[PDB]
């Protein structure tokens, strides 16, 4: 009878909110803490949200947290902790090739464990783009790296396209990560070159000053939406880096179309981070450089050198991140991240822009003094 | 792997077209032959499209074609033909009450057959709104009418609300058809009164001049969309009358949210139409009056008296109408009318506005002479 | 110095007009005689405009005029005249398979000549979609047809995708024409199936009533723009049929992104058209049926049967069409049709919408009596 | 074949971003750090970007960095350093005429060297507008100044037009710099007066308070776009001053249509700056006054007096600025500044607006403490 015969299954569900296409075609450069996600319907508990998310076309992870190839964030002790909790790591290329191959060998021998066909835990390693970096890839492949990141500030070079053509005939089983891209044109110029997964976002890092120096980049959330919108046409996941201070930005990045979220500062200064601790004004903190900083080794500095206070160990930290992600996906109303992105591209999951006074009341306000403890 | 993990099930499906909400909020008064439906995907043959569509909250028909309570369109010989091919009829109230009760008795004794629980074919009968028309309803209920139409040019009266309150306590099993409404406010003021199904559209009849005389009404397709949009919130089907010359307007009316389509001129001058034929200039044609014409029996004329050439019998005519509806629902890409409306309200089924030169090339053009034969 | 150092090469060139993307995102359903092309700069004569335009991914023609597979427009005597003047023909499938294979054999044995590698003039032949039409393709391939048209009113069926998968492994050198499509979604669902060239436009034929009957289709010029916009992403030409009464609509269709223009009524009633002439009211005219008319051989009629007055022979007619196309491309300001489409997609070639009174003064007006002779 | 015959040369290149005309017609007053430039395609190294940019209609420089005629920024020791690294200087007019003529004589006798026909390095000198300043120009022409700046807060006076008419008949080979203009109307009222190059921007200086005092001016980037848009119609370069703290604003100013960038505070407190150093709270800093400050020599103050910490010498500083400009032009994707402006006015180079939270994450964030070293 009529209660099914008019529409069928779908109830009314009023039209409060903006969809993602309506939000990112107003022209404004929205970042993470500039919009938010409207809630939906809950019919499931929090702990039964599966965070299965693809890294490349062939590589699938159990949780979408991947780390960033920076010489103060990832080495072997980092990648074992990221892969052991279900993510993946990327050993930086700011060292000698035998050192990077040694560390990839170290992590590859060694619950949600993210292991390959031969039951060893996964590992990635970023390479450069210059001609001498073809020798690094042949040392990383002998140690058996599973995925490589063509680490560059600008991903639309003829050099990176030539490197992708160099990899996709000498190693047909190896997965490559093209980047960095922010616009859909340079997404096109890499997906036709054979990239298995893009890496979106330039300028919005916690240490990047390349928007302040080179006048280039774009706001982060618009990049994550408008590259993933193009990249799902060809079945290519994207990776969002930079701009993450908290678990809310991870949920926003996953909701806008990113598959995994790459984090630099939020995993910096852990126990598994390279380097060691030192004290400044009584606060235990570990230093955190950028790749384009002039502490890399007439040159321009696309980054700064700084320090971050510690946050303990990762095995007590990324459980908080994954628990925050499933609570956010509960309040959104989807049982998986795939269902989050399906509800977003289907127009069901609706967003809303957030003004400046709305931002300053979204946080902590109207208190004399507070202490913010997250877990 | 990634081909499911980004979106899942839903492919890309580019964003060509306007949805119905984007189409009917431009402000323009679009009618039937002023927009059209963009096609979709076919994975089914034409003849397996089921046209099951609700008439009221309790009454379900097998095909959405219902007839109009006009004294030159429906009597017993009409209603047996409409119910016998799966629709329903409405015996007009432009006669004495014993005549209408006699004809409803005649049709109720007497494939897709539209029969009740006691296996007799369904029948409706329109009543007035004045106080003496309470005696007509008590004669039609003794003959056992299944649904009644509160036939009025303006459906938001206190008189019609009082008649609905009079019916919904003396006959709790009887179904009522409130109308005519064109705006969502008078949809609200009847659905809270207890109407089982609305009847949308004033002024857009083939013989109505009440837009030209009383300056009231609205364009038909916008009425059918904006009342059905309100009426599906409460599980109330709507009926669209007027403006139909062809099977294309039936498909457009069903796609915009109407459940059944009421037709006056397209079933006028059939063999089962009341009256008899006469010849004028060698063309066999049967006359067709309007209810608000001054040939009803200081008064204003809300209708004209005219004539329509014949179209044979209904049992060879409504097979053409239902075959046109399933071909249109094939080209749209939905297996049922319920799926058509679900794709429309879900934003999947997309429309496009059509300009004046687009209308004049949509029909027949650039020929010396042609003959248009439909079946 | 500064006259080159500010911009370089590009002069000012003020911003009068609308680009094609700005024109076909206002939402309106623009057809051919509803907009027009703003002129540009001339630095070349008319006769040195080359009309080289691709039919499929592999087939290239010398002039973009192709004919339509209709049983009153194309047979062998038509296809020899179309191929002999540089176009191509498509022998209709409204006959027995041995008759169509015989006529394709007849045209394949037999200046701008459009010939293959073996120096015989090209020929196409439309096939159906049903299972028994697999036997027609194997008879047309023995006679050596160069391209086939999957002739259908709706090109997004599972049946046509299955036919394309059936052709693209049994005949890897054969070219297929998918259609008919009007929206970019069904362009996607065929280009991934392996179509070499799309055929855009439904409803806008000179004899189609399928917008008036099945409530489906879209205005023609918006279809030609929005499918070619999607189809040039994958290097797939499109073919525009219907809506052409004159050489102006051919120039508008080629400017919006179509590569070749398929014409039904404008080549009907020629000397090379099938059938024979007859007189009605003293005018020599030849009949012209539609495929969906009920004169094909419970069924709906998607077309009408009519007649067109004669226009002589093609060898005196298509020189007028190609001369009109190069005069239009002169006034636009591009030396080739490829340069027309490059100027259109680059935003250089600008358009302007045209209102109803602008249409009625664009034609002939303010005269007592006139005679319109075109060549 | 078809891969060239549809469009030709131009690939798809999706439509992500806003062009400059779409950006500066939203009405908002965008400045430098309020939008940014989307990247493009790289097929060239950084060091082969030529920064050849015109100063006037006749004067061409090798790098677009010019200095500002302020009595604490430019004297002879400044202009030799600016011209020696390829730019040009402007000796201020806040002194006696014999002193300015002496210093212009000093700089004119005395790699990318910016030299005239007689192989001496170029020099400019600003003059006033009052009647006694006609005597300054006749002393500067005897020492042989190559270009003069009519230094004024408002460039649309009858006084400055009379001075331009006074110069362009007594010195037909001398180049004049009209300014300051911010709107296209006062660009028109000077270009018809005979200006060889405009000087755009009022109020947006690092020491100007004339927006806070005289309620006049406009945001800087909109001025640089909307005067250069008018000025390239007549082949007139523009010079952008004020609002520059970094090399990113230089790249944004050059991308919006400026030919050279005039900088006041970014070259203040160098070794070649006039005056001498002093210490305040342990930081070596040199004072930096404004021309409209009441330290010029009932009057209103259009400027403030302040101080800037040192940045070393220019011969180690402007190599950083030019290296930042060619890295920015690499990431944009153009081999020259002329190609940057050609891609901008052609609609190829696309921009994007940047919100407030996008600005606060574009810089350094989420760190405990950092040190920002640029080279
Ligand atoms: N958030 C971001 O995306 C971002 C932004 C800025 C910097 N960074 C980091 O800063 C690091 C350095 O940035 P980068 O791109 O300048 O490093 P890079 O060494 O890859 O680039 C150096 C320059 O050389 C050019 N190049 C590439 N291949 C070349 C070749 N064969 N020959 C000559 N030149 C070649 C590049 O165009 C570039 O201008 C990167 O590792 C990146 O991770 C990241
Ligand atoms: N397409 C349309 O919707 C449309 C438009 C115009 C006319 N019509 C047809 O024309 C016919 C006549 O139209 P109508 O509405 O004027 O018929 P009606 O007899 O119902 O209305 C007559 C007038 O009396 C008023 N009325 C209702 N109840 C009353 C009561 N107890 N006491 C006093 N006045 C009362 C009504 O407001 C109306 O002004 C209708 O049967 C209708 O079918 C239809
Ligand atoms: N301008 C246009 O695009 C246009 C519009 C209308 C009609 N036409 C012409 O009208 C002709 C007839 O139109 P048509 O599409 O109905 O012809 P058709 O025979 O191809 O279609 C007949 C119906 O059968 C279905 N079909 C396809 N394959 C099938 C299969 N194996 N089994 C069962 N059903 C199958 C189709 O969906 C369709 O509903 C066409 O040749 C076309 O050229 C063209
Ligand atoms: N970013 C900027 O554009 C900006 C803004 C404010 C101030 N400034 C600086 O401040 C300095 C002083 O500004 P200013 O324009 O007031 O200096 P000014 O001496 O040129 O102007 C003084 C006033 O006299 C008027 N004037 C010009 N010629 C005159 C004449 N023959 N007779 C009488 N009056 C005449 C002017 O209109 C002005 O009101 C300028 O050197 C300028 O560089 C720059
Ligand atoms: O030196 C730099 N300048 C600008 N961006 C950088 C630099 N080094 C790394 N990045 C990017 O910053 C990301 C991490 O930033 P974060 O997550 O904000 O801390 C990395 O994944 C890189 O993409
Ligand atoms: O007299 C009248 N004036 C205006 N509308 C009328 C009149 N009589 C009937 N109608 C309406 O016209 C509809 C049928 O019109 P048609 O389908 O266009 O022929 C009926 O269902 C009534 O709603
Ligand atoms: O029967 C029909 N109904 C609707 N469209 C048709 C029919 N037959 C052919 N067509 C289309 O009409 C086109 C030619 O129409 P014309 O060029 O306007 O004369 C053909 O190429 C077909 O795509
Ligand atoms: O006194 C003043 N008030 C406002 N603007 C000034 C003044 N003096 C100089 N300017 C402008 O400020 C520009 C330099 O400012 P800056 O580059 O922001 O440091 C100069 O080129 C002048 O156009």
GROMACS .gro file of C-alpha atoms in nm, chain A residues 96-366:
model
  271
   96UNK     CA    1   7.263   0.755   0.209
   97UNK     CA    2   7.100   0.484  -0.006
   98UNK     CA    3   7.261   0.198   0.185
   99UNK     CA    4   7.125   0.342   0.511
  100UNK     CA    5   6.769   0.357   0.377
  101UNK     CA    6   6.798   0.008   0.230
  102UNK     CA    7   6.939  -0.117   0.561
  103UNK     CA    8   6.648   0.032   0.753
  104UNK     CA    9   6.392  -0.108   0.508
  105UNK     CA   10   6.558  -0.449   0.549
  106UNK     CA   11   6.542  -0.400   0.927
  107UNK     CA   12   6.170  -0.324   0.927
  108UNK     CA   13   6.087  -0.596   0.676
  109UNK     CA   14   6.241  -0.883   0.870
  110UNK     CA   15   6.138  -0.780   1.228
  111UNK     CA   16   4.587  -0.781   1.590
  112UNK     CA   17   4.544  -0.527   1.310
  113UNK     CA   18   4.884  -0.601   1.163
  114UNK     CA   19   4.881  -0.506   0.789
  115UNK     CA   20   5.096  -0.791   0.655
  116UNK     CA   21   5.175  -0.901   0.300
  117UNK     CA   22   5.135  -1.237   0.125
  118UNK     CA   23   5.456  -1.363   0.290
  119UNK     CA   24   5.328  -1.257   0.634
  120UNK     CA   25   5.586  -0.985   0.694
  121UNK     CA   26   5.470  -0.640   0.794
  122UNK     CA   27   5.449  -0.382   0.517
  123UNK     CA   28   5.689  -0.096   0.460
  124UNK     CA   29   5.725   0.197   0.224
  125UNK     CA   30   6.014   0.419   0.132
  126UNK     CA   31   6.024   0.754  -0.042
  127UNK     CA   32   6.270   0.818  -0.323
  128UNK     CA   33   6.375   1.135  -0.497
  129UNK     CA   34   6.335   1.229  -0.860
  130UNK     CA   35   6.690   1.301  -0.982
  131UNK     CA   36   6.891   1.062  -1.197
  132UNK     CA   37   7.111   0.932  -0.914
  133UNK     CA   38   6.796   0.828  -0.726
  134UNK     CA   39   6.741   0.545  -0.973
  135UNK     CA   40   7.018   0.368  -0.780
  136UNK     CA   41   6.822   0.408  -0.455
  137UNK     CA   42   6.518   0.230  -0.596
  138UNK     CA   43   6.726  -0.069  -0.705
  139UNK     CA   44   6.861  -0.096  -0.350
  140UNK     CA   45   6.517  -0.064  -0.194
  141UNK     CA   46   6.373  -0.329  -0.425
  142UNK     CA   47   6.641  -0.579  -0.322
  143UNK     CA   48   6.530  -0.531   0.037
  144UNK     CA   49   6.175  -0.563  -0.093
  145UNK     CA   50   5.994  -0.234  -0.037
  146UNK     CA   51   5.622  -0.265  -0.101
  147UNK     CA   52   5.538   0.090  -0.212
  148UNK     CA   53   5.742   0.400  -0.296
  149UNK     CA   54   5.663   0.770  -0.269
  150UNK     CA   55   5.799   1.003  -0.532
  151UNK     CA   56   5.856   1.274  -0.273
  152UNK     CA   57   5.840   1.616  -0.435
  153UNK     CA   58   5.697   1.958  -0.361
  154UNK     CA   59   5.547   1.973  -0.711
  155UNK     CA   60   5.420   1.651  -0.859
  156UNK     CA   61   5.357   1.761  -1.216
  157UNK     CA   62   5.713   1.762  -1.341
  158UNK     CA   63   5.838   1.593  -1.653
  159UNK     CA   64   6.097   1.446  -1.415
  160UNK     CA   65   5.844   1.265  -1.199
  161UNK     CA   66   5.653   1.141  -1.503
  162UNK     CA   67   5.981   1.008  -1.641
  163UNK     CA   68   6.050   0.836  -1.308
  164UNK     CA   69   5.705   0.675  -1.314
  165UNK     CA   70   5.769   0.551  -1.668
  166UNK     CA   71   6.105   0.423  -1.542
  167UNK     CA   72   5.943   0.229  -1.258
  168UNK     CA   73   5.636   0.087  -1.434
  169UNK     CA   74   5.838  -0.128  -1.675
  170UNK     CA   75   6.129  -0.236  -1.456
  171UNK     CA   76   5.910  -0.326  -1.158
  172UNK     CA   77   5.558  -0.413  -1.277
  173UNK     CA   78   5.451  -0.537  -0.933
  174UNK     CA   79   5.572  -0.231  -0.740
  175UNK     CA   80   5.328   0.040  -0.630
  176UNK     CA   81   5.411   0.409  -0.668
  177UNK     CA   82   5.279   0.716  -0.489
  178UNK     CA   83   5.271   1.024  -0.708
  179UNK     CA   84   5.269   1.365  -0.549
  180UNK     CA   85   5.233   1.623  -0.441
  181UNK     CA   86   4.927   1.739  -0.631
  182UNK     CA   87   4.658   1.985  -0.529
  183UNK     CA   88   4.467   2.048  -0.850
  184UNK     CA   89   4.285   1.805  -1.075
  185UNK     CA   90   4.496   1.889  -1.380
  186UNK     CA   91   4.813   1.752  -1.224
  187UNK     CA   92   4.604   1.464  -1.098
  188UNK     CA   93   4.526   1.390  -1.463
  189UNK     CA   94   4.885   1.429  -1.572
  190UNK     CA   95   4.993   1.161  -1.323
  191UNK     CA   96   4.704   0.912  -1.339
  192UNK     CA   97   4.761   0.874  -1.713
  193UNK     CA   98   5.130   0.823  -1.634
  194UNK     CA   99   5.045   0.515  -1.427
  195UNK     CA  100   5.028   0.627  -1.063
  196UNK     CA  101   4.866   0.381  -0.827
  197UNK     CA  102   4.783   0.646  -0.563
  198UNK     CA  103   4.811   1.024  -0.536
  199UNK     CA  104   4.941   1.221  -0.237
  200UNK     CA  105   4.749   1.545  -0.207
  201UNK     CA  106   4.837   1.871  -0.037
  202UNK     CA  107   5.121   2.119  -0.062
  203UNK     CA  108   5.179   2.419   0.160
  204UNK     CA  109   4.944   2.312   0.438
  205UNK     CA  110   5.206   2.133   0.641
  206UNK     CA  111   5.278   2.223   1.001
  207UNK     CA  112   5.628   2.330   0.895
  208UNK     CA  113   5.577   2.429   0.530
  209UNK     CA  114   5.625   2.795   0.451
  210UNK     CA  115   5.605   2.735   0.078
  211UNK     CA  116   5.276   2.921   0.057
  212UNK     CA  117   5.442   3.211   0.237
  213UNK     CA  118   5.755   3.183   0.020
  214UNK     CA  119   5.664   3.048  -0.323
  215UNK     CA  120   5.304   3.181  -0.339
  216UNK     CA  121   5.186   2.838  -0.450
  217UNK     CA  122   4.961   2.566  -0.315
  218UNK     CA  123   4.597   2.570  -0.213
  219UNK     CA  124   4.392   2.525   0.106
  220UNK     CA  125   4.406   2.168   0.221
  221UNK     CA  126   4.045   2.050   0.237
  222UNK     CA  127   3.962   2.184  -0.107
  223UNK     CA  128   4.267   1.998  -0.240
  224UNK     CA  129   4.158   1.674  -0.073
  225UNK     CA  130   3.809   1.707  -0.218
  226UNK     CA  131   3.893   1.819  -0.569
  227UNK     CA  132   4.170   1.570  -0.631
  228UNK     CA  133   3.978   1.275  -0.486
  229UNK     CA  134   3.676   1.377  -0.695
  230UNK     CA  135   3.891   1.341  -1.003
  231UNK     CA  136   4.085   1.040  -0.882
  232UNK     CA  137   3.789   0.816  -0.804
  233UNK     CA  138   3.697   0.833  -1.173
  234UNK     CA  139   3.999   0.613  -1.240
  235UNK     CA  140   3.994   0.410  -0.919
  236UNK     CA  141   4.294   0.583  -0.761
  237UNK     CA  142   4.307   0.655  -0.386
  238UNK     CA  143   4.454   0.977  -0.252
  239UNK     CA  144   4.662   1.048   0.057
  240UNK     CA  145   4.619   1.371   0.252
  241UNK     CA  146   4.916   1.520   0.435
  242UNK     CA  147   4.957   1.837   0.636
  243UNK     CA  148   4.712   2.044   0.836
  244UNK     CA  149   4.631   1.772   1.089
  245UNK     CA  150   4.655   1.870   1.455
  246UNK     CA  151   4.384   1.639   1.587
  247UNK     CA  152   4.158   1.344   1.519
  248UNK     CA  153   3.886   1.575   1.387
  249UNK     CA  154   4.090   1.672   1.085
  250UNK     CA  155   4.152   1.304   1.011
  251UNK     CA  156   3.777   1.243   1.007
  252UNK     CA  157   3.718   1.546   0.785
  253UNK     CA  158   3.992   1.437   0.544
  254UNK     CA  159   3.851   1.085   0.524
  255UNK     CA  160   3.503   1.223   0.470
  256UNK     CA  161   3.606   1.445   0.179
  257UNK     CA  162   3.743   1.160  -0.027
  258UNK     CA  163   4.085   1.074   0.103
  259UNK     CA  164   4.154   0.709   0.167
  260UNK     CA  165   4.450   0.738   0.404
  261UNK     CA  166   4.575   1.036   0.602
  262UNK     CA  167   4.947   1.113   0.621
  263UNK     CA  168   5.056   1.292   0.937
  264UNK     CA  169   5.380   1.468   1.013
  265UNK     CA  170   5.354   1.670   1.333
  266UNK     CA  171   5.094   1.460   1.508
  267UNK     CA  172   5.329   1.163   1.523
  268UNK     CA  173   5.639   1.371   1.575
  269UNK     CA  174   5.798   1.358   1.921
  270UNK     CA  175   5.694   1.008   2.009
  271UNK     CA  176   5.910   0.737   2.160
  272UNK     CA  177   5.948   0.578   1.817
  273UNK     CA  178   6.044   0.904   1.651
  274UNK     CA  179   6.411   0.930   1.551
  275UNK     CA  180   6.649   1.149   1.744
  276UNK     CA  181   6.629   1.197   2.120
  277UNK     CA  182   6.460   1.421   2.372
  278UNK     CA  183   6.582   1.742   2.527
  279UNK     CA  184   6.441   1.987   2.778
  280UNK     CA  185   6.355   2.350   2.715
  281UNK     CA  186   6.195   2.556   2.996
  282UNK     CA  187   6.102   2.234   3.175
  283UNK     CA  188   5.901   2.078   2.890
  284UNK     CA  189   6.024   1.752   2.739
  285UNK     CA  190   6.026   1.807   2.364
  286UNK     CA  191   6.181   1.656   2.053
  287UNK     CA  192   6.290   1.850   1.747
  288UNK     CA  193   6.103   1.836   1.418
  289UNK     CA  194   6.255   1.970   1.096
  290UNK     CA  195   6.106   2.012   0.754
  291UNK     CA  196   6.248   1.872   0.433
  292UNK     CA  197   6.260   2.210   0.262
  293UNK     CA  198   6.421   2.373   0.562
  294UNK     CA  199   6.778   2.484   0.504
  295UNK     CA  200   6.886   2.224   0.760
  296UNK     CA  201   6.849   1.967   0.479
  297UNK     CA  202   7.227   1.910   0.473
  298UNK     CA  203   7.177   3.050  -0.286
  299UNK     CA  204   6.905   2.807  -0.183
  300UNK     CA  205   6.552   2.889  -0.072
  301UNK     CA  206   6.399   2.748   0.244
  302UNK     CA  207   6.058   2.590   0.196
  303UNK     CA  208   6.035   2.485   0.560
  304UNK     CA  209   6.129   2.562   0.916
  305UNK     CA  210   6.311   2.379   1.193
  306UNK     CA  211   6.131   2.350   1.523
  307UNK     CA  212   6.025   2.125   1.809
  308UNK     CA  213   5.716   1.947   1.943
  309UNK     CA  214   5.642   1.834   2.297
  310UNK     CA  215   5.617   1.461   2.346
  311UNK     CA  216   5.301   1.252   2.337
  312UNK     CA  217   5.426   0.921   2.475
  313UNK     CA  218   5.440   0.609   2.261
  314UNK     CA  219   5.245   0.526   1.948
  315UNK     CA  220   5.098   0.201   2.081
  316UNK     CA  221   4.910   0.412   2.332
  317UNK     CA  222   4.854   0.697   2.084
  318UNK     CA  223   4.711   0.555   1.760
  319UNK     CA  224   4.449   0.357   1.959
  320UNK     CA  225   4.320   0.702   2.053
  321UNK     CA  226   4.327   0.810   1.688
  322UNK     CA  227   4.139   0.506   1.564
  323UNK     CA  228   3.889   0.533   1.851
  324UNK     CA  229   3.827   0.896   1.760
  325UNK     CA  230   3.776   0.798   1.396
  326UNK     CA  231   3.515   0.535   1.479
  327UNK     CA  232   3.336   0.773   1.717
  328UNK     CA  233   3.328   1.033   1.439
  329UNK     CA  234   3.202   0.773   1.191
  330UNK     CA  235   2.938   0.674   1.445
  331UNK     CA  236   2.814   1.032   1.479
  332UNK     CA  237   2.817   1.068   1.100
  333UNK     CA  238   2.616   0.749   1.074
  334UNK     CA  239   2.817   0.513   0.856
  335UNK     CA  240   2.956   0.172   0.944
  336UNK     CA  241   3.273   0.204   0.734
  337UNK     CA  242   3.491   0.469   0.576
  338UNK     CA  243   3.374   0.334   0.241
  339UNK     CA  244   3.020   0.407   0.352
  340UNK     CA  245   3.131   0.756   0.461
  341UNK     CA  246   3.264   0.833   0.116
  342UNK     CA  247   2.963   0.669  -0.051
  343UNK     CA  248   2.729   0.887   0.154
  344UNK     CA  249   2.940   1.190   0.064
  345UNK     CA  250   2.954   1.137  -0.311
  346UNK     CA  251   2.589   1.030  -0.314
  347UNK     CA  252   2.482   1.362  -0.163
  348UNK     CA  253   2.345   1.194   0.149
  349UNK     CA  254   2.616   1.304   0.392
  350UNK     CA  255   2.579   1.680   0.426
  351UNK     CA  256   2.825   1.945   0.542
  352UNK     CA  257   2.805   2.300   0.670
  353UNK     CA  258   3.043   2.594   0.643
  354UNK     CA  259   3.164   2.748   0.968
  355UNK     CA  260   3.239   3.118   1.024
  356UNK     CA  261   3.512   3.273   1.238
  357UNK     CA  262   3.305   3.339   1.550
  358UNK     CA  263   3.162   2.991   1.501
  359UNK     CA  264   3.519   2.861   1.510
  360UNK     CA  265   3.605   3.053   1.825
  361UNK     CA  266   3.302   2.917   2.002
  362UNK     CA  267   3.354   2.567   1.865
  363UNK     CA  268   3.662   2.530   2.082
  364UNK     CA  269   3.702   2.598   2.450
  365UNK     CA  270   3.567   2.934   2.562
  366UNK     CA  271   3.421   3.126   2.856
   0.00000   0.00000   0.00000
